[PDB]
Structure formats: structure tokens, C-alpha cells
Design a protein around this ligand. Structure first.
Ligand SMILES: *[C@@H]1O[C@H](CO)[C@@H](O)[C@H](O)[C@H]1NC(C)=O
Ligand SMILES: *[C@@H]1O[C@H](CO)[C@@H](O)[C@H](O)[C@H]1NC(C)=O
Ligand SMILES: *[C@H]1O[C@H](CO)[C@@H](O)[C@H](O)[C@H]1NC(C)=O
Ligand SMILES: *[C@H]1O[C@H](CO)[C@@H](O)[C@H](O)[C@H]1NC(C)=O
Length: 378
């Protein structure tokens, strides 16, 4: 009996469909701690007004609207012995608007030429998925036709007499699962002559720097226009073998690296080749990791006039940075409070010091919170 608040469950980032929403957060402690919420930093008045339902800490919003709920939430729990704030949870809303036109100018191409048909997704939020339709049926993907999942563009390495007709981009919001269709774009062949042969020209490629988060699947795209139609090949610019766990898809337009690790980082190249020559694209897969607790602060009891020492340690990439909190408020160094980075030092203690403390570790990729109680003995 007699304990400050500790989190049993904290709020998580959310991408919510606009077609309910629960922000989980539960606390234990004695006395039973009261829970409050903060949007962008301002206390949310739950009893008034909405249909907010704070069920056991967890905030419910029973009918959402983007324009007024488009920020980051924080759950704060308080009892007699002090206050702890939870990690920040970003609340975003997903949607995909319709195209605002039903037809499109025809494009006229020389047979043998490479070409790009641009999707041009409508305003949206959340991750998108893409496919194309050709003359009423799904457009076939291969060596010569590549659809980018980053942009939705359709690439034809080499236009052939079989390619004449209508092309439609079908955009899909992967989180809401709604789809919208673009305007058909008519493709016709020039009758003025044909395009001869030329060396590959890479038109879709991974960026010059591609941040790769630890433990995720990194996907690289590479595809070239050319005549004859190029072959694609992947290799590392420092001669290191690509991992055996790496797979290739879509006639080698895509290199997947599952469960990314430090050893997989480095300069990657894709090579486009045909009989007329070769083209090389390169980029740097740069490894990064959100903070993770190595050493956390823990509850501490001390006698009235004695000293205390706390240290926080977090791994991550870049290396994490440290700030401190007392009872939910920014705590900076004074007397007898000496705080340097991940260290807190109280030279002599008084009843005033007893309370909840928090070490926060952050890098440009993430923040993490830890909390402990400091009780002082009569
Ligand atoms: C919170 O801030 C973001 C911009 O930083 C804004 O988009 C959002 O609407 C804000 N939340 C509200 C509704 O006050
Ligand atoms: C595409 O379809 C339209 C009808 O929607 C048709 O008139 C036209 O012949 C087709 N375009 C081409 C380039 O063949
Ligand atoms: C939220 O605000 C927008 C306009 O700012 C409006 O279109 C929508 O109907 C509103 N929804 C609610 C629940 O108030
Ligand atoms: C921290 O406490 C004080 C600074 O407030 C310092 O004199 C002392 O040596 C430090 N303690 C340790 C063990 O780091």
C-alpha cells in the first residue's frame, strides 16, 4: 500500500479510416490514479463536449473528424504521490478522394520507344496500392511492363504493336481499402516511323539515400526503358554478397531485404543491360533504429538528508538523447539537483523531492519514456 502511478497500457500511434476509435491507456497504483488527456498539449474536456467515453483510462471518440482531431495525444496519470505522462501517440486519418476528371488526352508513341504513363493519385492519406487496366482487362506485368508501388506509374520498356488501346490506373488505399479509378488514357502508334535501338535508361530507382529501419523489410525498385528490353541485376557496390534472405520480384524490378540489420547496410547498385550497353543506378541503404531501453531508472527509497543517483541508458541510431521530468513537468538542473544528460544527482534530499520522475530518450526517429517513484523516509 502506497504507490505512485505506473502504466499497465499506453496509447499507440493510429492511422484511422474515416468510414469507434479507442486510445488505450490504463494505470495501476494506490491510491487509484486519475487519468487525463492532452491533444497537441491542451487538456481535453471529456464530460463536455462530445461523446467521449473514458473507459478505464482509454479515451474513446465515438464519431471522428479529421480537421479537429488531427494531432498527437498524451495520457497523464496522477495520484497523491505525483504524476507520470505517457508516450505521445499521433492520430492521423486516412482517405482517398476521387479523380476529378473522366477522360484524358491520347498519347501517340513510336513503336520501339520507351514510355511512362503517370498515375497521378488524388489527395489521400495512408499507404496506396496500384494496378492498371488495359482494354477492359488487368494489364499484364513483366520484363517489359512495370508498375511502381511507390508512384503508381506504368513503365513500358519498349512499345510494341500489341500496346494500342486504353490504360486506366486503379488506386487503392490499403488502410481503408477504398479504390478510385483514373481516367482512361488512350495510347496510339505513330505511323511516321519507328524508334531504333538504344542503351538502357533507368527511369525508376531507389533514392540516393534510403533510411532502413532495423527489423523491417526494405524494398528497392529499379526499372529501365530500352530497346531491346533490358535485363535487371542487383549487386553491392563494395563487393559484399547480397544476403541469401533477400528475394527478387517482378522480373527483378524489385529487391526485397527482410528483417534489415546492420550487416545489410551499404551502397547498393542496380544494373540495366541490353545489347546496346548498360546503365547503373546506386544508392545508400542507411541503417537506423528507434531508441530502446538498456538501463532504466527504478523506484528508490532514501533517508531524509542522504543522496540519490539515477542513470538512464538507451540504444538506438543515431545515439539517443536524454531529458528529464518531475511530475509531468520539464526538470532541469538546479541545486541540489545536478542533471547531466542521462544522469540525475541529488546531493542532499528533502521531503519536497519525493515524487514521480521520468527519463526520456529520443532520436530523430523515436522517443521512449521511463518512470520511477522517489519516496523519502520520515
Ligand atoms: C495539432 O497540430 C497539428 C499540426 O502540428 C494539426 O494538424 C492538428 O490539427 C492540431 N490538432 C488540433 C485539432 O488542434
Ligand atoms: C479507347 O476507348 C475509347 C472508348 O472509351 C475508344 O473510342 C477508343 O477507340 C480507344 N482508344 C484507342 C487509342 O484505341
Ligand atoms: C469536422 O469538421 C469539418 C469541417 O471543418 C466538417 O466537414 C465535418 O463535418 C466535421 N465533423 C464533425 C464530427 O464535427
Ligand atoms: C553526483 O552528485 C554530486 C553532484 O551533484 C557529485 O559531487 C557526486 O560525486 C556525484 N555522484 C556520483 C557517484 O556520480
Amino acid at each position: 500500500p502506497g504507490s505512485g502511478p505506473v502504466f499497465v497500457q499506453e496509447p499507440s500511434h493510429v492511422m484511422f479510416p474515416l468510414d469507434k476509435v479507442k486510445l488505450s491507456c490504463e494505470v495501476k497504483g494506490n491510491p487509484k490514479p486519475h487519468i487525463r488527456w492532452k491533444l497537441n498539449g491542451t487538456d481535453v474536456d471529456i464530460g463536455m463536449d462530445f461523446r467521449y467515453s473514458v473507459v478505464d483510462g482509454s479515451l474513446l471518440i465515438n464519431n471522428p473528424n479529421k480537421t479537429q482531431d488531427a494531432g498527437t495525444y498524451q495520457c497523464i496519470a496522477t495520484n497523491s504521490f505525483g504524476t507520470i505522462v505517457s508516450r505521445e501517440a499521433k492520430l492521423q486519418f486516412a482517405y482517398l478522394e476521387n479523380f476529378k476528371t473522366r477522360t484524358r488526352s491520347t498519347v501517340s508513341v513510336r513503336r520501339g520507344q520507351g514510355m511512362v504513363l503517370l498515375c497521378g493519385p488524388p489527395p489521400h492519406s495512408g499507404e496506396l496500392s496500384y494496378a492498371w487496366i488495359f482494354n477492359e482487362y488487368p494489364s499484364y506485368q513483366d520484363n517489359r511492363r512495370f508498375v511502381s508501388q511507390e508512384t503508381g506509374n506504368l513503365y513500358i520498356a519498349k512499345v510494341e504493336k500489341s500496346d494500342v488501346g486504353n490504360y486506366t490506373c486503379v488506386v487503392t488505399n490499403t488502410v481503408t481499402n477504398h479504390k478510385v479509378l483514373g481516367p482512361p488514357t488512350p495510347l496510339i502508334l505513330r505511323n511516321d516511323g519507328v524508334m531504333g535501338e538504344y542503351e538502357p535508361k533507368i527511369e525508376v530507382q531507389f533514392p540516393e539515400t534510403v533510411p532502413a529501419e532495423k527489423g523491417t523489410t526494405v524494398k528497392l525498385e529499379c526499372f529501365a526503358l530500352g530497346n531491346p528490353v533490358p535485363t535487371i541485376l542487383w549487386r553491392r557496390a563494395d563487393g559484399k554478397p547480397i544476403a541469401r534472405k533477400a528475394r527478387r520480384h517482378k522480373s527483378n524490378g524489385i529487391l526485397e531485404i527482410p528483417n534489415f540489420q546492420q550487416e545489410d547496410a551499404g551502397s547498393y547498385e542496380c544494373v540495366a543491360e541490353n545489347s546496346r550497353g548498360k546503365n547503373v543506378a546506386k544508392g545508400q541503404l542507411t541503417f537506423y533504429a528507434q531508441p530502446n531501453w538498456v538501463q532504466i531508472i527504478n523506484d528508490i527509497h532514501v533517508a531524509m538528508e542522504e543522496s540519490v543517483f539515477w542513470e538512464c541508458k538507451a540504444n538506438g541510431r543515431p545515439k539517443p538523447t536524454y531529458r528529464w521530468l518531475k511530475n509531468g513537468d520539464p526538470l532541469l538542473t538546479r541545486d541540489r539537483i545536478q542533471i547531466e544528460q542521462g544522469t540525475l544527482n541529488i546531493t542532499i534530499v528533502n521531503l519536497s523531492d519525493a515524487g514521480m520522475y521520468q527519463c526520456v530518450a529520443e532520436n530523430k526517429h523515436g522517443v521512449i519514456f521511463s518512470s520511477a517513484e522517489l519516496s523519502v523516509i520520515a
